Amino acid sequence: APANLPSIFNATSTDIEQLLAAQCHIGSKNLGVHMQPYLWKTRADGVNILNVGKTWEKIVLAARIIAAIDNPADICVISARPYGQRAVLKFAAHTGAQAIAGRFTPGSFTNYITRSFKEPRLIIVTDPRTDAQAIKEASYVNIPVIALCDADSPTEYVDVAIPTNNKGRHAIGCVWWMLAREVLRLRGTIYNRETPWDVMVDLYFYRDP
Amino acid sequence: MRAKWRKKRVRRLKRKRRKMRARSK
Amino acid sequence: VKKRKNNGRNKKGRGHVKPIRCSNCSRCTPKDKAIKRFTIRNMVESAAIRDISDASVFAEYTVPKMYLKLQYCVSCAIHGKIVRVRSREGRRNRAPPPR
Amino acid sequence: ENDRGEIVDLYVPRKCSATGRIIKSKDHGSCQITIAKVDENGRAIQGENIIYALSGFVRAMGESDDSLNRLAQRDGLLKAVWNPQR
Amino acid sequence: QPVTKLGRLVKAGKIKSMEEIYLHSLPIKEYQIVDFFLPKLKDEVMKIKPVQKQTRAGQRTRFKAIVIIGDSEGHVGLGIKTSKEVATAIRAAIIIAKLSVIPVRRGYWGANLGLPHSLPVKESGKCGSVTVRLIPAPRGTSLVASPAVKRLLQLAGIEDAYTSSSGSTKTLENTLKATFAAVSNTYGFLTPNLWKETKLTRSPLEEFAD
Amino acid sequence: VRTSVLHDALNSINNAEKAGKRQVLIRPSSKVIIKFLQVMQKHGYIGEFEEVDDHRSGKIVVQLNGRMNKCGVISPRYNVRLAELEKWVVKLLPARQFGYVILTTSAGIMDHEEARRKHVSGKIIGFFY
Amino acid sequence: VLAVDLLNPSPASEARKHKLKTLVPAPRSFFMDVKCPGCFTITTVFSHAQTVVICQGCTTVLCQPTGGKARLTEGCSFRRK
Amino acid sequence: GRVRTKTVKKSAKVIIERYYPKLTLDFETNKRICDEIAIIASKRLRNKIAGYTTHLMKRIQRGPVRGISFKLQEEERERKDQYVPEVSALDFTGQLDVDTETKDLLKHLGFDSIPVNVIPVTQA
Amino acid sequence: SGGKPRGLNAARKLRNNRREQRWSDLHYKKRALGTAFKSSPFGGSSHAKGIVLEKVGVEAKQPNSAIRKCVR
RNA sequence: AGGGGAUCGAAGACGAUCAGAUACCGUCGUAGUCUUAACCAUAAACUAUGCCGAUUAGGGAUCGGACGGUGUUAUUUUUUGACCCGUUCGGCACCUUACGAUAAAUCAAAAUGUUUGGGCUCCUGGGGGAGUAUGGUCGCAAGGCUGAAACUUAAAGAAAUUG
RNA sequence: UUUUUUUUUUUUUUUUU
Ligand SMILES: [Mg+2]
Ligand SMILES: [Mg+2]
Ligand SMILES: [Mg+2]
Ligand SMILES: [Mg+2]
Ligand SMILES: [Mg+2]
Ligand SMILES: [Mg+2]
Ligand SMILES: [Mg+2]
Ligand SMILES: [Mg+2]
Ligand SMILES: [Mg+2]
Ligand SMILES: [Mg+2]
Ligand SMILES: [Mg+2]
Ligand SMILES: [Mg+2]
Ligand SMILES: [Mg+2]
Ligand SMILES: [Mg+2]
Ligand SMILES: [Mg+2]
Ligand SMILES: [Mg+2]
């Protein structure tokens, strides 16, 4: 903590409020061996309560990795289910990433003549179980993977795990909100750490057509 | 030929062999 | 080649299981290996249910249901189309067909 | 090294930061996680960063996340995540 | 001409040596890269093996070619391609062979003068049932391998080695793949000389933004 | 029935090493095991090993640094002459400058290279490289 | 996990594991004092007593053995030593 | 049966994806459209393309079809995406109704200042 | 592999087991039993002399159609 | 060798089918099927997977015991049973995966093996001839156990692939 | 869910930039 982590990055009550309101502390009923460190407590009904403190702390580290690339076009974000689709396009809009929503075409990373050849440098996925095709293709071209892992979510190649609820619309948007703000602060487009951001939270929440 | 009844055919042939030897003995 | 992990039955740890007789063959087959169907259908066909209700006297009578347990061998179940040949990958699916 | 003290190897492979196993040339799936340092104002410093190399073996097993957490605190990038007693 | 990010960097001079690529696990997808960094290579054809598919109107005959590419400096590549024609299969096998070129570690037997003459350790590769084992040999002992394996070891630059083989060595495709695995694994068996900290550096791909 | 506690220790060590684990629990405790561990530690192929005391055969927790290829025992403990070390080393080790064959001599548990210096021999019990 | 400090496990884990499989086999049993009703004598009873313990002179049964754990006679108070 | 081939369907979609304002629901007018914009030189093919084009245009008047933009949708989905209510659903405006274990996390994390309303946890 | 004994004082078992199992080797069994001296038409010699009794023809095995010329 | 003998049913007799039908199909039907006393010792006697021991990926069911907690239910001078959640020991198994293995099918063992050594026992060496001949031994017999050779042959065989 | 036996010997493919 004292080294390479100033006290500014510590959590704020506002961040805790939004994460709790999004129910990011409500995890899946099934606990994985690799998601054990992120477990706080298990309720009487069997629903696992996560540790929001680690969730925010992991988000800062994830933003640090994103800012280290110094090329927005080399960052790729994927979401299959429509709940995370809306957040992913908005995240690409403000950050500068390349987004894929819905079906991920196989051979995007390995096959170089397909229409969706990417050559990215960082794979950010939501619910790394329905995006297993994206993860597996990353196992061929040496791309670190950041995933919004849940308690039962497989962590086959998840290099950086963000323990959060990844099934509700509110939880996904808030976590994608946290990362979007943090990345922009790190890169420098936002002058102050304490200043509020003009964009709000419901812009990332999934909406029906 | 089935091995079950190849075994039976040989086993029957062995019984006849023993009778031929008892006849000589 | 071993076609099935459970061979063709369910007796792992049971040693020996008393056999039974096929419903339409009288074949002597083990109880766990046999293919068993529990059938619950009305004792009168749906077409003739109305006429039975007409003859009800005594008009609140509910027609009883026949309670049959049919046991088949592999040859009879396949020939009777109770079960069908499945693919190599589809053989492992131990789930009853949905309704 | 030879008797003259000269390196004759074509190159020297790297070692995984979690298990220490040499990462082979054709060991695809072995990622190189790069984390940039920050100043007192939270601005990422360009050209100065922490570099981690992970073999494909540790990634495939699914322990890459926990190993990264241990490595980050060993270099001080995290406050309280990795618990030895757990 | 280049189509991938590495291809652009190679012709742009952003990569100086081939082993610079080898340090990072960067896949090579364009065979013009290998020709650029490794000229004077020598291609040798082992065998043309006819493989046939049974059809309702006869047998569909395809030819499989096995080609090894290497220079005596310590790089070898093995490529197998099946095609309708021998000429096309040979050409495509060469392209695949150049793509899968790997560095070869060379060690020594006891001494430390004129050291790069033999294998550094004992390595064995197993493809299918064939197991080929390579053993470091004292200087002055020539290659003691079978002609198929001996030719491949010659292209690797190895001069002294003891070789053994189990399994069905008559499968020439399997033996070469088994030998290739052993040569691949001799450079990643951890040794005392490699038991030293290394300063990690960013890959050229993630530091150049062209 | 336990027959070679030395094999149990080295098998447990090698299993954890291949799995990438940085530590391993060893049961039980023996004089041979501790001396065999110390031979590892002198050449640096392992790190700290700690012995837990108990009113029975003890336990050992060995911290692994990851620079350990293969450790194994030899059964039986063949009687080795001085001329037989080179054949034993050649047929059992990698290139003859990294690994170390472990013997038990009248001088104690010690290396094959150390035997050439002290001009002694004994029974082979294990190896590492 | 690849990194565990096996020397000092959690006390919750110690109460979770088997009595032999812990780092040091500490017995899970205890000795306990039974207060019988109607008298003021203290008798030490094993937690896992296999015999019907009767107090010294009170001629009253204090526990019945069953299922590897003594069941104290109703109307008696106990205090673990 | 009368099932149109891909050479008709793919070409018609490109016509709609480009020339939607010029097109309409009348086959006779759509017949003349294909004359100016496309090079068919085949009356049967051109009639089929115009006929299939008219079919989708009538479909467009209902909300379908997926995958045939039709840039007028593209500008529309832009304004759908930009839409956002001013009052956040995450606002506490009884402020935060969580359970005993959630509030315990707040004490552990050092944030025991949120207006937390502790609710019981029981199993039915 | 096999469950061969691995004691330091099991040479007797190892030699006895090898002696038993070596009989299954066809070439050792032929030499050890001395079948060439017993049952072979020759007395184990490379050549032998004889008197021609008659000339016989042998039909060739499939696929081959010819009369191989031989003598008894 | 006695008792019993309902049903079914080798052998056998008929009636069909068929070119024939000493079979499948149908009607009879003896030994047997059942039991006491004494033999026999073989099965695709199969998990085709020897016994002991250590380690190694996750998960949920289930059986027996034990422990901790919780709330209903029956009894109760508030114990016990049923149900619920969790931990652990010992079982029958199962689901996904491959850091591994195998030729492959597949395997948490068939893993920890050319980087080859934890302990012990048994069996195999291309296909036939042949589990045959002979000798021995056990059995009332049927047979069991042990067990060749001459001669003959370029394949036999295993797992998958396309037709 | 009536039955449907048999098909004379041999013969059925090769190389490289
Ligand atoms: Mg049985
Ligand atoms: Mg062989
Ligand atoms: Mg011994
Ligand atoms: Mg021939
Ligand atoms: Mg038998
Ligand atoms: Mg058997
Ligand atoms: Mg075991
Ligand atoms: Mg259980
Ligand atoms: Mg229980
Ligand atoms: Mg059981
Ligand atoms: Mg042989
Ligand atoms: Mg044989
Ligand atoms: Mg076959
Ligand atoms: Mg025929
Ligand atoms: Mg005929
Ligand atoms: Mg015939």
Beta bridge partners of D5: none
CA to C1' distance (Å), from I32 to J150: 17
CA G5 to each of CA A144, E122, F24, F25, G10: distance values in angstroms, whole numbers, following the listed order: 28, 36, 10, 11, 10
E124 φ, ψ (degrees, to nearest 5): -135, 140
Long-range contact list for A188-192, CB < 8 A, 24+ apart? A188/D43, A188/D44
Whether the CB-CB separation of A122 and A74 falls below 8 Å is answered with: yes
As to burial, measured by CB atoms within 10 angstroms (0-12 exposed, 13-18 middle, 19+ buried), residue D61 is middle
Centre of ligand 6 from the C-alpha of residue C3, in Å: 19
Q: Which nucleotide lies closest to I63 by the C1' atom and the CA atom? A: K10
Beta bridge partners of B8: none
Which of A160, A124, A158 is closest to D69 using CA atoms? A160
| Cβ within 8 Å of residue F69, ≥6 positions away | E189, E190, F128, F129
Whether the CB-CB separation of E46 and E74 falls below 8 Å is answered with: no
- The amino acid that residue F98 corresponds to is F
- Using a 7 Å cut-off to protein CB atoms, list the covered nucleotides of chain K: 1, 9-11, 14-17
Which of D30, D35, D19, D29 is closest to D72 using CA atoms? D35
Whether the ω angle into residue H65 lies within 30 degrees of 0, i.e. cis, is yes
Q: Considering only CB atoms, which chain H residues are within 8 Å of A92? A: none
| Cβ within 8 Å of residue B25, ≥6 positions away | none
Q: Do A112 and E4 touch (CB under 8 A)?
A: yes
Best interface-test mutation with F: which of I4, I8, I14 has the largest number of F CBs within 10 A? I8
Which of E27, D66, E202, D34 is closest to A122 using CA atoms? D34
C-alpha to C-alpha distance for B10 and B16, rounded to whole angstroms:
10
Tell me which residues have their CB within 5 A of the ion that is ligand 3: F 76; I 7-8
Beta bridge partners of H91: none
Chain-centroid distance, C-alpha A87: 10
Residue D15 C-alpha, separation from nearest chain A C-alpha, in angstroms: 16
Positive/negative CA dihedral, E2, E7, E12, E18: negative
- Asked if the C-beta of A140 comes within 8 angstroms of chain E's C-beta atoms, the answer is yes
Which of A173, A65, D65, A91 is closest to E206 using CA atoms? A65
C-alpha to C-alpha distance for A183 and H71, rounded to whole angstroms:
32
- Asked if the C-beta of D45 comes within 8 angstroms of chain A's C-beta atoms, the answer is no
C-alpha to C-alpha distance for F70 and F18, rounded to whole angstroms:
9
**How many contacts (CB atoms, under 8 Å) link F and G?**
19
Whether the CB-CB separation of H23 and H56 falls below 8 Å is answered with: no
Q: Considering only CB atoms, which chain E residues are within 8 Å of F94? A: 121-122, 189
Report which of residues 48-77 in chain E place their beta carbon less than 7 angstroms from any atom of strand K. 48, 50, 61, 63
Q: Which nucleotide lies closest to I1 by the C1' atom and the CA atom? A: J113
* Tally of residues, chain I: 72
As to burial, measured by CB atoms within 10 angstroms (0-12 exposed, 13-18 middle, 19+ buried), residue G9 is middle
Beta-sheet pairing, A145-148 with A123-126: parallel
Which of A87, A88, A97, A78 is closest to A22 using CA atoms? A87
Which of A137, A139, D48 is closest to E207 using CA atoms? D48
Task: Give chain D's count of helices (H) and strands (E).
Answer: 2, 2
Which residue places its CA closest to the C1' of nucleotide K14?
E50
Q: What is the phi-psi region of residue E197: left when phi exceeds 0, alpha when psi lies from -120 to 50, beta otherwise?
A: beta
- Using a 7 Å cut-off to protein CB atoms, list the covered nucleotides of chain J: 47-60, 65-68, 70, 77-80, 84-89, 92-96, 98-99, 101-107, 110, 112-126, 130-134, 142-143, 149-151, 154, 158-163
Token pair of B9 as six digits:
């055919």
Which of A37, H87, I13, A101 is closest to D63 using CA atoms? A37
Which of A101, A96, A102, A142 is closest to A119 using CA atoms? A142
- Asked if the C-beta of I3 comes within 8 angstroms of chain F's C-beta atoms, the answer is no
- Asked if the C-beta of F54 comes within 8 angstroms of chain G's C-beta atoms, the answer is yes
Q: Which nucleotide lies closest to E189 by the C1' atom and the CA atom? A: J115
Interface of F with E in 59-118 (CB under 8 A): 67, 69, 94-98
* Tally of residues, chain E: 210
Q: Considering only CB atoms, which chain F residues are within 8 Å of G6? A: 23, 25, 61
List, in sequence order, the alpha helices (H) in chain C: 49-55, 74-79
Local structure of residue G61 (DSSP, 8 states): B
Beta-sheet pairing, F59-63 with F23-26: antiparallel
Whether the CB-CB separation of A26 and A47 falls below 8 Å is answered with: yes
CA Rg value for chain B: 11
C-alpha to C-alpha distance for E5 and D69, rounded to whole angstroms:
31
| Cβ within 8 Å of residue G19, ≥6 positions away | G25, G26, G27, G28
Token pair of C71 as six digits:
């046991």
| Cβ within 8 Å of residue D24, ≥6 positions away | D13, E25, E184, E185, E187, E188
CA to C1' distance (Å), from C88 to J160: 14
Q: Do E25 and D25 touch (CB under 8 A)?
A: yes
Q: Do E3 and A112 touch (CB under 8 A)?
A: yes
CA to C1' distance (Å), from H118 to J45: 68
C-alpha to C-alpha distance for H2 and F66, rounded to whole angstroms:
70
Give, for A19, the enclosing helix (H) or strand (E).
helix A13-21
Q: Which residue has the tokens 């008709």?
A: H8
Q: How was this model experimentally determined?
A: cryo-EM
Which of E175, E70, E153 is closest to E106 using CA atoms? E153
Number of neighbouring beta carbons within 10 Å of residue E96:
17
Q: Which residue of chain A is at minimal alpha-carbon distance from E30?
A: A112
Which of A112, A197, A123 is closest to A160 using CA atoms? A123
Token pair of A126 as six digits:
């939501």
Give, for F112, the enclosing helix (H) or strand (E).
helix F112-118
Q: CA angle, H17 as apex, H16 and H19 as ends, to 5°?
A: 60
Resolution in A: 2.7
| Cβ within 8 Å of residue I16, ≥6 positions away | none
Chain-centroid distance, C-alpha G62: 14
C-alpha to C-alpha distance for F102 and C85, rounded to whole angstroms:
61
Whether the CB-CB separation of G77 and G59 falls below 8 Å is answered with: no
C-alpha to C-alpha distance for A113 and A108, rounded to whole angstroms:
9
C-alpha to C-alpha distance for E44 and E78, rounded to whole angstroms:
10
Q: Which residue has the tokens 């013997």?
A: F103
Q: CA angle, G61 as apex, G59 and G65 as ends, to 5°?
A: 150
Whether the ω angle into residue I63 lies within 30 degrees of 0, i.e. cis, is yes
- The amino acid that residue F104 corresponds to is T
Local structure of residue A142 (DSSP, 8 states): T
First to last CA, chain A: 45
Q: Which residue has the tokens 């703000």?
A: A181
Instruction: Find the largest Cα–Cα distance for chain G.
Output: 60
Task: Give chain C's count of helices (H) and strands (E).
Answer: 2, 4
Token pair of E38 as six digits:
């490794």
List, in sequence order, the alpha helices (H) in chain E: 5-11, 18-23, 31-37, 86-99, 147-156, 172-185, 204-207
Whether the CB-CB separation of A79 and A125 falls below 8 Å is answered with: yes
- The amino acid that residue F45 corresponds to is Y
CA I1 to each of CA E164, E171, H3: distance values in angstroms, whole numbers, following the listed order: 19, 24, 67
Centre of ligand 6 from the C-alpha of residue C89, in Å: 30
